[PDB]
Amino acid sequence: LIPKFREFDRERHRTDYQKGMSYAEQQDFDMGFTIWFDHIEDLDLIEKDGTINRIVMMSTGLKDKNVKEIYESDIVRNLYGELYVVEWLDGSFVLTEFYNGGYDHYIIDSSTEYEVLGNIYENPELLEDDNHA
Amino acid sequence: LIPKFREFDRERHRTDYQKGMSYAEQQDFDMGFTIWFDHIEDLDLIEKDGTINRIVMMSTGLKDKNVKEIYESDIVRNLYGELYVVEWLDGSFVLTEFYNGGYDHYIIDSSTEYEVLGNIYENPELLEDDNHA
Predict the structure, then answer these.
(1) What is the sign, positive or negative, of the torsion defined by CA atoms of A88, A33, B76, B103?
(2) What range does the domain containing B50 cover?
(3) Residue closest to A122 by CA, chosen among A55, A68, A67, A61
(4) Which of A15, A64, A102, B44 lies at a C-alpha separation of 20 to 30 Å from B17?
(5) Are A67 and A46 in a shared domain?
(6) Cβ neighbours, 10 Å, residue A126
(7) Residue B11: in which H helix or E strand, if any?
(8) What InterPro entries is this protein classified in (chains A, B) (predicted)?
(9) Are both A50 and A71 inside the same structural domain?
C-alpha cells in the first residue's frame, strides 16, 4: 500500500480558505485501499470515462534534515547550497538541476543532507534564478 | 494516481481456484482513488486498528523486452544471462544480485534489455542457484 501521496489542485490554491496541496489519508479495507484527498475543484480534469488527471505526487520514502518526508516535486537544497527539484524518472527519483543545467542525479539517501524549501506548485519563486518573489 | 499496484496473498496462492497475485484496478472519484485487489484471504494481516499489512508491489513504470510492465519483486534476466530481483531501495528501484552477491544496481531503462522470468512469491525456484524446481 506503501508510498504516501499528495495532490495539488490549482483551483483550491486560488481559493483562500482551501489548501491547494492535500496530503492523503490511506484507508485499508478487504479488497484494497483508498487514497483520500480534499475534494477536487479543477473539474476540467474529470474525463467522460471517469478518469481524473489530478496532479498527484508520491513520497520518496526519505526524510530531509528537518525530518520532513521528501516528495516528488519538492525543491530541496543540499549542504553545499545547490537547489534541485525532486523528479520521478525512469524507475527512480532523481534531483534535477534547474539553474541552467538540466542534469539529473539519482537521489542519494544522503537524504538527511537535503532540506525541503518548498515545491514547484506552491513556491515557483524558488525556481527563479535570482531567488524568489 | 500513477503507479500500478499488485498484491500477493499467500492464502489465495494455496487455494487452487484463486490467484495468489492480484493486479489492481484503479478507480478515480472526486475525493481520491481506490486501488482494488481480489478479496484478502490472509486474515492474520488485518490489525485491530484497521490497517492491513498486505504484500503490495508497485510498478517501475518500465517495460521489459516482451513489453511486460516490470514490477517490484520481479525476477529479471539481462542480455548477458545475469538474474536480479527488482527491489525498492532508498528512493529508487534497483536490481539486486542473489546468486551470492548482494550488490544493488540502479535499474537502467535499458529496461527493454531485461526479461521478466517471474517473481519471488510465485516463482521461488528461480532464486535457487542451480536453476529452478
Answers:
(1) positive
(2) 1-60
(3) A55
(4) B44
(5) no
(6) 18
(7) helix B10-14
(8) CHP16711, YopX-like_C, YopX-like_N, YopX_protein
(9) no
- Residue B16's Cα: distance from chain center in Å? 21
Query: What technique determined this structure?
Result: X-ray
Do A28 and B50 lie within an 8 Å CB cutoff? yes
Q: Which letter, b or e, does each residue of B18-45 get, where b requires 16 or more Cβ atoms within 10 Å of its Cβ?
A: eebbbebebbbeeebbbbbbbebbbeeb
Listed resolution, Å: 1.8
DSSP B50-106: S-B--EEEEEEEEE-TT-PEEETTEEEEETTS-EEEEEEETTEEEEE--SS---EEE
Alpha carbon distance B75, A92 (integer Å): 18
Q: How many domains does chain A have?
A: 2
Rounded Cα distance between A131 and A118, Å, is 13
A contacts of B7 (beta carbons < 8 Å): 32
User: From CA A79, how far away is CA A133, in angstroms rounded?
Assistant: 23
CATH code, A1: 2.60.430.10
Nearest-CB residue to A92 (from B35, B56, B92): B92
Q: Which residues of B touch A93 (CB under 8 A)?
A: 91-92
- Is the domain of B53 the same as that of B103? no
The reply to whether B118 and B129 lie within a common domain is: yes
Q: Closest partner residue to B107 among A37, A46, A92, by Cβ?
A: A92
Q: Where does residue A90 fall: left (phi above 0), alpha (psi -120 to 50 degrees), or beta otherwise?
A: left
One-letter amino acid identity for A123? Answer: N
